[PDB]
């Protein structure tokens, strides 16, 4: 109830039938309270976030992961309930990669990225470990033809490998599905599209094997297409050359055994500028003050800003096959980018987490890069945005009173650690793995410090005693489950 600014939208958090069309709203009057609760009398490039939704600042000596490669998503090995699994003996961790000596620029290595892995040992506390993490690495994750395999005998210039998600299909075996983004480009001379990009979810089984030295794969040569945008419930490329797809999450309904979802980026059905955007994407409280008018929002352009979180079930019990189903959330005249949802469980709540920039917010709506987070009931439920209803969880430090900048170009009374990380995600007890972008004119192509934040209810705050002051070593990614396969430990 802050003075100057609408008041949040009222959400009930209840649950509602995942295969119901139920499509909750981040809605402008939830995402104003972001700059409702932004300190507007702090200097040019301080923080002028609240200090419990602000990551601690990473330093700028930090240490890179491996010398050799660009390393920025990172998930790791999780069965069917989001824990994370060592297997005998060994961490393990999946990451898009590229090639920092090869002829591009950090910023064009996009249209490049592979996925490769990352292993060191599992059981040692993070205080035991170099201080780069201690991870030796594994090389790409799959044989070199095979994820081009889904565009066989299509035109494009570049393929790459985009992030997801690797499912312990055997809990003590070592049957593991990867989730994955499978893009393709048809980029001109000036990198401009010809032909608009393609987006498909991916699966592709393997083996994960390991001895005493060393970890290593088998089998994915098979990468199975598993849902790509209709242009009904989730925008296509025929619909926006500039469309999101990508970032696959599964998880075994815990109320429903046997019964799997999925959850993914999106964008909201329809052509690109299209200014149809409702009262609702608005969701202000009758006569409230302060509320914006419709016509105010669309003239404004915010209609471009169209995301949404989706959801997906698997049709049978090999994870091979999946239909659609309506959006959990959409973001539409709020922001353009929701990227990477996870569900997440926490005191019998369910909290989807999510990632965005401040430059893809709608017009008039502003916010930090970092991580976003919806609490409810159940899957599919009427989710609160956390945090003065706000939907923020952590930002980087940002000035949200000064213009914005970029990773590459720098404003200079913006803070130097706005783009400090990305892709944060959120590992059991609330600890919270990233990647570093920019801190201070050095670009990091590496894990940043494990982070750790408590969260309580439709509300959050980063834990200032976790390791060091809140910052917990870097590239901490720990097991919190132990996969001891004795048989494929002696089949080798």
């Avoid at 834990?463 to 080798?492: K, S, T």
Wanted: aromatic residues 12%; proline residues 7%; charged residues 15%.
């Amino acid at each position: 109830g802050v003075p100057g600014f609408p008041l949040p939208s009222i959400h009930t958090q209840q649950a509602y039938d995942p295969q119901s069309d139920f499509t909750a709203r981040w809605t402008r009057a939830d995402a104003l309270q972001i700059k409702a609760h932004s300190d507007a009398t702090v200097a040019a490039g301080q923080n002028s976030l609240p200090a419990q939704l602000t990551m601690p600042n990473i330093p700028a000596d930090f240490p890179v992961i491996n010398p050799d490669v660009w390393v920025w998503d990172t998930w790791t090995l999780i069965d069917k309930h989001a824990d994370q699994f060592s297997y005998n003996g060994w961490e393990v961790i999946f990451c898009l990669t590229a090639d920092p000596n090869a002829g591009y620029g950090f910023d064009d290595r996009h249209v490049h990225a592979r996925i490769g892995f990352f292993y060191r040992r599992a059981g040692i506390p993070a205080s035991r470990r170099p201080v780069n993490g201690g991870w030796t690495y594994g090389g790409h994750l799959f044989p070199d033809g095979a994820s081009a395999q889904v565009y066989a005998g299509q035109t494009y210039t570049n393929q790459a490998e985009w992030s997801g998600s690797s499912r312990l299909m055997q809990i003590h075996g070592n049957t593991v599905s990867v989730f994955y983004t499978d893009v393709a480009f048809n980029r001109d001379a000036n990198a401009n599209n010809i032909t608009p990009p393609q987006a498909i979810i991916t699966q592709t089984l393997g083996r994960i094997h390991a001895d005493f030295n060393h970890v290593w794969f088998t089998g994915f040569t098979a990468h199975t297409p598993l849902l790509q945008p209709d242009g009904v419930l989730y925008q296509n490329g025929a619909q926006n050359e500039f469309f999101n797809f990508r970032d696959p999450f599964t998880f075994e309904d815990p109320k429903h055994p046997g019964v799997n979802y999925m959850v993914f980026e999106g964008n909201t059905a329809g052509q690109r500028g299209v200014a149809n955007c409702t009262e609702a994407d608005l969701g202000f409280r009758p006569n409230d003050p302060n509320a914006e008018t419709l016509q105010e929002v669309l003239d404004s352009g915010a209609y471009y800003q169209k995301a949404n979180i989706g959801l997906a079930i698997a049709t049978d019990s090999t994870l091979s096959k999946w239909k659609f189903l309506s959006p959990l959330i959409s973001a539409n005249c709020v922001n353009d980018q929701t990227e990477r949802p996870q569900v997440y469980l926490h005191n019998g709540k369910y909290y989807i987490f999510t990632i965005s920039h401040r430059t893809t917010f709608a017009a008039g709506v502003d916010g930090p890069d970092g991580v976003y987070g919806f609490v409810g009931d159940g899957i599919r439920s009427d989710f609160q945005p956390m945090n003065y209803g706000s939907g923020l969880t952590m930002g980087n430090p940002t000035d949200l009173n000064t213009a914005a900048g970029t990773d590459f170009d720098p404003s200079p009374d913006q803070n130097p650690r706005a783009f400090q990380s990305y892709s944060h995600y959120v590992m059991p007890g609330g600890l919270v793995e990233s990647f570093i972008d920019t801190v201070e004119n050095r670009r990091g192509g590496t894990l940043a410090p494990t982070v750790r934040v408590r969260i309580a209810q439709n509300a959050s705050a980063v834990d200032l005693r976790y390791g060091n002051g809140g910052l917990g070593g870097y590239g901490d990614i720990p097991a919190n489950r132990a996969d001891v396969n004795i048989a494929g430990f002696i089949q080798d």
